[model samples]
Target: MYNYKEVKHMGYGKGYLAMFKNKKVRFKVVNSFPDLKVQFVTSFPDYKVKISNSSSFCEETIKIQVVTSFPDVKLQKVTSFGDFEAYID
Candidate 1:
């Protein structure tokens, strides 16, 4: 089973966009500052996912020290959208 570690971080992206698509799925996100807001559109409406504003990190596992707030988010699965691709702005 794959996990969110499969696609996160992405090389110090700040205030930019990333787009991904496939025959069965499409998703997009815009990050302003250190936060990322993402939306997913899928062939199966019930399976659509949303991961809103947070920090960015590009590793499978990041052990971070937080003065306050949460750690990182995990991106686990994608259907119809086979294979993964990423680009920074």
Candidate 2:
């Protein structure tokens, strides 16, 4: 688990990006702006996932991108100070 942040000029929050290459999972915002889009991709062939764009403070739990069968990966929200979570197992 890791946390990252980028602040724009003045006082806008750029949000965060998380990369867990060792786990073959990565999460990132499309742009480094206060209100940016979110997406996730994995090297795992059987599982696919995605997250939508929203205010930096939005919390959500999204499922994987699979046509059939249960998904093995998931995106979860951690309210312990506003953080993103990616679980792959």
Candidate 3:
């Protein structure tokens, strides 16, 4: 086994990533002060991430257009060793 253990984030990530649930997520891609650090890859992802790269909370339920500025979480793509791993399909 690897030295690190994979903690179950329950799809919703630890800390600010708690806002994520289902795919109703809308992410605002940022370069600074991001909520959670994630390394996006098609292989070896901790969670199932979309090609869309989306996040958080406007409501438990709401609607979105193709590309809206805000609705949920913030993202800054991280390293091969990140706060969380992502597998994009």
Candidate 4:
């Protein structure tokens, strides 16, 4: 089963806002052990990605894509979710 939780709903303060200015950030799981899930984070414009895994026995394939009309942000083919499984503030 695939379970996903957003950063805003976790019970934190105002933190995710930082993601708008920065390029990359870290994320974590919610109700799992130290190792039982994994997440793929990436950025656009330059096309960069960071992967974090928890479960050693679990093997999964990840795919990321970011497209933009113009280049104001100049961030294309990048990661959208700042904190994938992590909380806010």
Estimate, for each residue in 1-89, the C-alpha lDDT of model 1 and write its tens digit: 12444555463221222222221222233333334333233333222223223225322221212122332322323422434323222
Give lDDT tens digits, candidate 3, residues 7-74.
34323333334434332344444556543345433354344433333333222221211223432433
In candidate 3, position 26 carries an lDDT of 42
Better of 2 and 4 by lDDT: 2
> Model 2: per-residue lDDT, tens digit, 1-89?
22253333332112222332212233332223323222233332322333333434333222223223343332333322223334321
Candidate 4 deviant stretches above 4 angstroms: 1-11, 32-89
Q: Candidate 2 — which pairs collide?
A: 48-65
Per-residue error for 33 in candidate 3, Å, reads 1.3
Local error of candidate 3 at residue 4 (angstroms): 34
Ranking by TM-score: 3, 4, 1, 2
Q: Which candidate wins on lDDT?
A: 3
- Pick by TM-score: which candidate is best? 3
lDDT of 2: 0.30
- Residue 52's C-alpha lDDT in candidate 3? 34
Count clashes in each candidate, considering only residues at least 3 apart in sequence or on different chains: 4, 1, 5, 6
Each prediction's Cα lDDT score? 0.29, 0.30, 0.36, 0.29
Worst 10 residues of 4 by lDDT: 58-67
